[PDB]
Amino acid sequence: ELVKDVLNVLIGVVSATFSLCQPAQAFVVKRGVHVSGASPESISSLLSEVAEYGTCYTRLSHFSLQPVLDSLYSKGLVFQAFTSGLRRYLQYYRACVLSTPPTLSLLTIGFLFKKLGRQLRYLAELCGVGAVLPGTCGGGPRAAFPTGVKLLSYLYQEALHNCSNEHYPVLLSLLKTSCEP
């Protein structure tokens, strides 16, 4: 019954939360601690991993969603292409989240989404924004994301570094789009 929320926690919702705030001080995800309604602690912990996936989705969605605005002086044309391609992936990920059956068992939801969860968390860490606010460190670092030839080259060295792993198709697609300018 509560799992319906979790299905939509994969997307941004309010039942669980992504307070755009400092990790664990005001940044929050809805949780039941100590007294709870038919929710032993383990249930909250499983919800917490799904929450990790949720926070990564919301942050990455913001990062890519922020469009050029037609006056993007700080970033480059190639960064704008990068964000477009990333949004293409995000749309597909959202589609799978939708394609999840509404009626599904509590453990089965998380076990179904493990592979995509780790894939997405990796994709997040690939970008500074996703890497920042991991949950283990604050939003203070705010690591500078490369732009231009720096960005393109950084992507390609990461492609060499992570060529063989399961995650490589995503990098290839991003690079194909990014090179066009």
Binding site: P40, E41, S42, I43, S45, L46, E49, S105, L106, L107, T108, G110, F111, K114, R118, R121, Y122, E125, L126, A131, E158, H161, N162, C163, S164, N165, E166, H167
Partner: protein
């Protein structure tokens, strides 16, 4: 005592099953309501969950944790990453088995622990076997291709399921070896 088992074996503790880093998963060992007979069965089941938690930890530690940033075979390496990639996919049928269990428990609201013991008893043997494969790599700081030999020498295991399971991993890692050979040659 039913659904909590599937949570813990999925690898997230509950109050009944205290995780301690030293003892892995561990029952509190003292509840007046349950008699000692079920406790031993629970511990036997918890061994598998302990191994699963240790596996998930090690995998998370050495795969995707960084964007390739001290590089050294024990610490890091393409081959180590390939081993982690193989390990999670070899552990996938355990995930599916627990899934089918939850479906059948949705079907029936009163199922003994012995039934769980049965349906999971095939992995009860495979997981300990893979444990030494990882353990030698950690202990000996095995470097580069030597992991390939390390798994190959346990490919002569006299357990057919263990043999096939490790064979999958060696196929994956031969992936990267063939790949590096695919540039220089």
């Amino acid at each position: 005592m039913i659904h909590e088992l599937l949570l813990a074996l999925s690898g997230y503790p509950g109050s009944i099953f205290t995780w301690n880093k030293r003892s892995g998963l561990q029952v509190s060992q003292d509840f007046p309501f349950l008699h000692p007979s079920e406790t031993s069965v629970l511990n036997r089941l918890c061994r598998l969950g302990t191994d699963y938690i240790r596996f998930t930890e090690f995998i998370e530690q050495y795969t995707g944790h960084v964007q390739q940033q001290q590089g050294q075979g024990g610490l890091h390496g393409i081959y180590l990453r390939a081993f982690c990639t193989g390990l999670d996919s070899v552990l996938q049928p355990y995930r599916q088995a627990l899934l089918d269990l939850e479906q059948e428990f949705l079907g029936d609201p009163h199922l003994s622990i012995s039934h769980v013991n049965y349906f999971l008893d095939q992995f009860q043997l495979l997981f300990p076997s893979v444990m030494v494969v990882v353990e030698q790599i950690k202990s000996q700081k095995i470097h580069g291709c030597q992991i390939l030999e390390t798994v190959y020498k346990h490919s002569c295991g006299g357990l057919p399921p263990v043999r096939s399971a490790l064979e999958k991993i060696l196929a994956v890692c031969h992936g990267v070896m063939y790949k590096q050979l695919s540039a220089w040659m």
